[PDB]
Structures are given as structure tokens and as C-alpha cells.
Design a protein around this motif. Structure first.
Motif, PDB file in Angstrom:
ATOM      1  N   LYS A   1       1.010  -0.888   0.035  1.00  0.00           N
ATOM      2  CA  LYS A   1      -0.035   0.053  -0.073  1.00  0.00           C
ATOM      3  C   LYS A   1       0.879   1.300  -0.040  1.00  0.00           C
ATOM      4  O   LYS A   1       2.093   1.161   0.531  1.00  0.00           O
ATOM      5  N   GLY A   2       0.502   2.256  -0.536  1.00  0.00           N
ATOM      6  CA  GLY A   2       1.183   3.656  -0.796  1.00  0.00           C
ATOM      7  C   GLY A   2       0.425   4.708  -1.243  1.00  0.00           C
ATOM      8  O   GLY A   2      -0.576   4.876  -0.818  1.00  0.00           O
ATOM      9  N   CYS A   3       0.765   5.300  -2.226  1.00  0.00           N
ATOM     10  CA  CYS A   3       0.189   6.295  -3.113  1.00  0.00           C
ATOM     11  C   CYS A   3      -0.410   5.930  -4.345  1.00  0.00           C
ATOM     12  O   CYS A   3       0.189   5.331  -5.164  1.00  0.00           O
ATOM     13  N   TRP A   4      -1.692   6.227  -4.525  1.00  0.00           N
ATOM     14  CA  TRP A   4      -2.394   5.779  -5.807  1.00  0.00           C
ATOM     15  C   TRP A   4      -1.985   6.768  -6.883  1.00  0.00           C
ATOM     16  O   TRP A   4      -2.577   6.569  -8.012  1.00  0.00           O
ATOM     17  N   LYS A   8       4.994   6.603  -4.739  1.00  0.00           N
ATOM     18  CA  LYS A   8       6.109   6.491  -3.850  1.00  0.00           C
ATOM     19  C   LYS A   8       5.393   5.802  -2.445  1.00  0.00           C
ATOM     20  O   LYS A   8       4.533   6.298  -2.149  1.00  0.00           O
ATOM     21  N   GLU A   9       5.930   4.877  -2.206  1.00  0.00           N
ATOM     22  CA  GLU A   9       5.479   4.192  -0.734  1.00  0.00           C
ATOM     23  C   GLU A   9       5.786   4.843   0.432  1.00  0.00           C
ATOM     24  O   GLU A   9       7.162   4.580   0.713  1.00  0.00           O
ATOM     25  N   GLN A  12       0.293   8.857   1.798  1.00  0.00           N
ATOM     26  CA  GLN A  12      -0.923   8.307   1.151  1.00  0.00           C
ATOM     27  C   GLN A  12      -1.195   9.100  -0.222  1.00  0.00           C
ATOM     28  O   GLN A  12      -0.446   9.136  -1.164  1.00  0.00           O
TER      29      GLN A  12
END
Ligand code: ZN
Length: 18
Positions: A1-4, A8-9, A12
Motif C-alpha cells: 500500500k502507498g500512494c495511488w 511513492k510508498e 498516502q
């Protein structure tokens, strides 16, 4: 999970103004 947006993990998808 990270930024959609940029992917960049770390942050958010709320503070991705970079
Ligand atoms: Zn991002």
C-alpha cells in the motif's frame, strides 16, 4: 500500500502535492 497518485510508498494520496 502507498500512494495511488505518484506511487511513492511513504505518503498516502492526501499530501501528494509534490
Ligand atoms: Zn504520491
Amino acid at each position: 500500500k502507498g500512494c495511488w497518485k505518484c506511487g511513492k510508498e511513504g505518503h498516502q494520496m492526501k499530501d501528494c502535492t509534490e
